[PDB]
Amino acid sequence: MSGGDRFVQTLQKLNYPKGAQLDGEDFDWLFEAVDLKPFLDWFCSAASEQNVVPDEKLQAFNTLKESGKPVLDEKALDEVLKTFSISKVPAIEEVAIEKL
């Protein structure tokens, strides 16, 4: 597998919008540079689908930051999320006057 084909596959995994049109052979030259090769190899190993934040979530998070609400650190999130039963506890539809 030519270094270039690996790179293009990684990009597809990372949901790059123009990734389907890219031919691997066009990037084989990037791996010929003895000095950059270690970095590119690293990148193609380190970057997976779990690392990808869609533009929507990033915008939403920036909005959250801008909203002046404190961004909970990982420890705090862990504490609070524990308290979260996966189970679809239907959003307590606040007993909509309708429910009452």
Binding site: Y16, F27, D35, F43
Partner: protein, 52 residues
């Protein structure tokens, strides 16, 4: 001037955000080569959408 700046952002992204040991990080001069042609748009994407 634009290539040099992106090369710095990529370095920062690689070292600060993805945790690449500073010692293994290619020289800014060397990273500038990655922003040649169509590769430039790709790495811009990577810096923006790919996080730890």
């Amino acid at each position: 001037m634009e290539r040099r700046s992106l090369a710095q952002e990529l370095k920062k992204w690689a070292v600060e955000e993805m945790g690449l040991p500073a010692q293994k990080a290619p020289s800014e001069e060397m990273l500038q080569r990655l922003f040649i042609g169509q590769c430039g748009d790709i790495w811009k994407f990577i810096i923006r959408h790919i996080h730890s």
